[PDB]
Scaffold this active site. Structure first.
Site, PDB file in Angstrom:
ATOM      1  CG  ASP A  60      -1.948   1.131   1.184  1.00 21.67           C
ATOM      2  OD1 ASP A  60      -2.072   1.699   0.108  1.00 21.67           O
ATOM      3  OD2 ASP A  60      -2.637   1.454   2.186  1.00 21.67           O
ATOM      4  CG  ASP A  85      -3.181   4.212  -3.075  1.00 17.67           C
ATOM      5  OD1 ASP A  85      -2.560   3.193  -2.695  1.00 17.67           O
ATOM      6  OD2 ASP A  85      -4.229   4.626  -2.564  1.00 17.67           O
TER       7      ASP A  85
END
Ligand SMILES: Nc1cccc(CCc2ccc3cc[nH]c3c2)n1
Length: 377
Positions: free
Chosen positions: A34, A220
């Site tokens: 992440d 992201d």
């Protein structure tokens, strides 16, 4: 770095994860990668969705920090107890580091029923760490305690099951073709970048670039979609709709409120425009652009029970928190999180899905003025 090739696994919509070990003796867990957050957090209790969880009681090296953390989302959250412990990556560098770990003791809409991961590795910077920026992220501890160079790179593929590579501490030239182009990290909190121009198909949205970055644009790996701020998404969609008037689709579809469907093998790569984002370059008045296909913003939904067709979702959507360059974007490219030089590198991925019509590209230099006016303050 061949030890690290193919070290990532996953399923569509459910993110990419890497095998990690925590505590002594080592406990193996699958950990979601992440770049959109900065906490290393793992399931620590027998939640029924989980294959595995961190058992602190089994670890000689565990140390309690005697503080909890509470992490809200939209009608979702996790909550945990802070500690540190020894952490390794079996298919990563040959080190062991003492890291902060949030032992997740309660959660809501966080873990995915049917997924094969049990934690999250937040790879962004301290500023967005919780509960505060004094909790040192994993990668900061990794770099500080070892001789691993302060960078990592990600090749996200997705061929069902998906795969990819997280190269920790370097770049693997087998994972890309052509040249890497770099965009500055504007600020070290999220992996923040500046989009300076957007072209659907070659033709450009002609809107104040500042809006493309209202109030953020970030890279992201923990988001599936290309997400665009409402005003830019509005115009974004407006142009994609006209680009593609050839065949009609419902209004809800564009808002991600309905799936679209065609039969097996029944979309011919064409009715949809390419999307090019021009990113701020390393040099004043110089930009470059990355180009993706609809076989990237049109993503098959893994398994719909009420259908037998190629039912794709539309991977573009809106936000009050900004642009988000998620897996839709990153799956076209090899992406280099060059933390040491405050920059993110993009190159055509050796694993991106192409054919012999259109093809994902990274191209430059272009001349763009006032690229700083594109950033929001
Ligand atoms: N980057 C980011 C944004 C929002 C939430 C999170 C938490 C980690 C995460 C949870 C669920 C899913 C599904 C697909 N990717 C993720 C990531 N991180």
């Amino acid at each position: 770095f061949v030890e690290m090739v193919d070290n990532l696994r996953g399923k569509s919509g459910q993110g990419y994860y890497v095998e990690m070990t925590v505590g002594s003796p080592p406990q193996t867990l699958n950990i979601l990668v992440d770049t959109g957050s900065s906490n290393f957090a793992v399931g620590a209790a027998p939640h029924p969705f989980l294959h595995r969880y961190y058992q602190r009681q089994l670890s000689s090296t565990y140390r309690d920090l005697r503080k909890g953390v509470y992490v809200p989302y939209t009608q979702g959250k996790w909550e945990g107890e802070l500690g540190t412990d020894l952490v390794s990556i079996p298919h990563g560098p040959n080190v062991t580091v003492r890291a902060n770990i949030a032992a997740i003791t309660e959660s809501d809409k966080f873990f995915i029923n049917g997924s094969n991961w049990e934690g999250i590795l937040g790879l962004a910077y301290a500023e967005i760490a919780r509960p505060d920026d004094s909790l040192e992220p994993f990668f900061d501890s990794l770099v500080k305690q070892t001789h691993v160079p302060n960078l990592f790179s990600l090749q996200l593929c997705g061929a069902a099951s998906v795969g990819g590579s997280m190269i920790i501490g370097g770049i693997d030239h087998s994972l890309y073709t052509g040249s890497l182009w770099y965009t500055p990290i504007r600020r070290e909190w999220y992996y923040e970048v500046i989009i300076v121009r957007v072209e659907i198909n070659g033709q450009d949205l002609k809107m104040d670039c500042k809006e493309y970055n209202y109030d953020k644009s970030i890279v992201d790996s923990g988001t599936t979609n290309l997400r665009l701020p409402k005003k830019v998404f509005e115009a974004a969609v407006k142009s994609i709709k006209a680009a593609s008037s050839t065949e009609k689709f419902p209004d809800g579809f564009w808002l991600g409120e309905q799936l679209v469907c065609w039969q097996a093998g029944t979309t011919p790569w064409n009715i949809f425009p390419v999307i090019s984002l021009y990113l701020m370059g390393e040099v004043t008045n110089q930009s470059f652009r990355i180009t993706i296909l609809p076989q990237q913003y049109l993503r098959p939904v893994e398994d719909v029970a009420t259908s037998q067709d190629d039912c794709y979702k539309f991977a573009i959507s809106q936000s009050s928190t900004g642009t988000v360059m998620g897996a839709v974007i990153m799956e076209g490219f090899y992406v280099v999180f060059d933390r040491a030089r405050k920059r993110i590198g993009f190159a055509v991925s050796a694993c991106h899905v192409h054919d012999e019509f259109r093809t994902a590209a990274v191209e430059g230099p272009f001349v763009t003025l006032d690229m700083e006016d594109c950033g929001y303050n």
